Amino acid sequence: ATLDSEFTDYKAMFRYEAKVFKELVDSVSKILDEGLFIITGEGLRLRGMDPARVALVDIEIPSSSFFDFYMAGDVERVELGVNMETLKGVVARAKKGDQLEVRVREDKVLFIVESVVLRRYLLPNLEVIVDVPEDISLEFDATATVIADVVKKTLRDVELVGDIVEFDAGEDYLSIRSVGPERRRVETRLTRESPALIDLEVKEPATSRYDVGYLKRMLGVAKIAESIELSFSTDKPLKMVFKSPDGSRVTYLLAPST
């Protein structure tokens, strides 16, 4: 027994901003149908690949980013398996200042959303298969921090004229461009004089192509961060990291079009 008198069969609980959680959920739903969240003393983590193994999403909310957070004493790790379409339903109404509370046991997951009304949901805790790529030294030849709205608008424009986007980094610039025969070719060239280019480090030149449809879906989460940290190498995966001011983090990995 604990000094808590409410919800004493649950193994973990947290409280968080429902609107930010809705944005984190949506970011995952672009990649995964079902996700396995893990709750530990460090906070909340999810990582998984889509079925084609072409894209990955990784969510981290440090325990210090939560309004409240605790785990039962006999437990180091608590899994939360959930379908992302169902979870969007739970937090669909969310506005600024609405709080979400989540309590987790092995067989069930309680969600309480404080919105216009108090919404309560009780979900089964799903068994979810996690697939992740092999853990190796991923080397990135090129890294750039860019204002996220500029990347999103670039991808919008590229998609007008083709379905592949090329990232071209030289020593002192980053070019994002459409390819293929439709005209005019769209090109956003950033240099260290561009306000949009916060930082650029290029170890070696890198040129890679990616599915713009997929990247566009990924940039849906741009409204959680002012800037995006991009990393890539020639004919290797692009990594994109969105760092929220509250400390939560969304990372994506996207395999190249070859």
Author numbering: 5 to 262
Give verbatim lines from the article:
Among these factors, proliferating cell nuclear antigen (PCNA) forms a trimeric ring (sliding clamp) around DNA and directly enhances the activity of proteins involved in replication. Several enzymes bind to PCNA via the PCNA-interacting peptide-box (PIP-box) motif, including DNA-dependent DNA polymerases, flap endonucleases and DNA ligases involved in DNA replication. Analysis of the A. pernix genome showed that the sequence contains three PCNA genes: ApePCNA1 (APE_0162), ApePCNA2 (APE_0441.1) and ApePCNA3 (APE_2182) in the KEGG database. The sliding clamp of A. pernix forms heterotrimers and enhances polymerase activity in the ApePCNA1–ApePCNA2–ApePCNA3 and ApePCNA2–ApePCNA3 complexes.
The crystals did not contain a threefold axis and the subunits did not form a ring-shaped trimeric structure. The ApePCNA1 subunit is composed of N- and C-terminal domains and a long loop called the inter-domain-connecting loop (IDCL) that connects the two domains formed by Leu130–Gln145. The PCNA rings from other species have an inward α-helix region. Interestingly, the N-terminus of ApePCNA1 interacted with the cleavage groove of the adjacent ApePCNA1 molecule. The hydrophobic side chain of Leu7 is placed in a hydrophobic pocket formed by Met53, Leu60, Pro137, Pro241, Leu257 and Ala259 in an adjacent subunit. The consensus sequence of the PIP-box is QXXhXXaa, where X is any amino acid, h is a hydrophobic amino acid and a is an aromatic amino acid. Furthermore, the N-terminal region of ApePCNA1 was suggested to be an anchor sequence that induces PIP-box binding.
